[PDB]
């Protein structure tokens, strides 16, 4: 299988429309696609666009190094 990026919500968010995804603090959201400023996520069977400054992407050890 391949590991998709995951993010943890730093602040709650309420979807402004049906294309966006609401979430709460601590939610672990799986990212399907990245645009500028907005990422497409999936959480508990709901999929939508999220503001990418509301979340922090979890360190993984396959596609990054320092």
């Amino acid at each position: 299988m391949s590991k998709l990026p995951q993010v943890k919500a730093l602040y709650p968010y309420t979807a402004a429309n049906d294309e966006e995804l609401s979430f709460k603090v601590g939610d672990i959201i799986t990212i399907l696609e990245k645009d500028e400023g907005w990422w497409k996520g999936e959480l508990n069977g709901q999929e939508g666009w999220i503001p990418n400054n509301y979340v922090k992407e979890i360190l993984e050890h396959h596609h990054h190094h320092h």
């Binding site: 602040y11 645009d35 400023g37 907005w38 990418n52 400054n53 509301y54």
Partner: peptide, 9 residues
């Protein structure tokens, strides 16, 4: 504890 503004995009 202030949310930032969403990305103007």
């Amino acid at each position: 504890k202030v949310a930032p503004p969403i990305p103007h995009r």
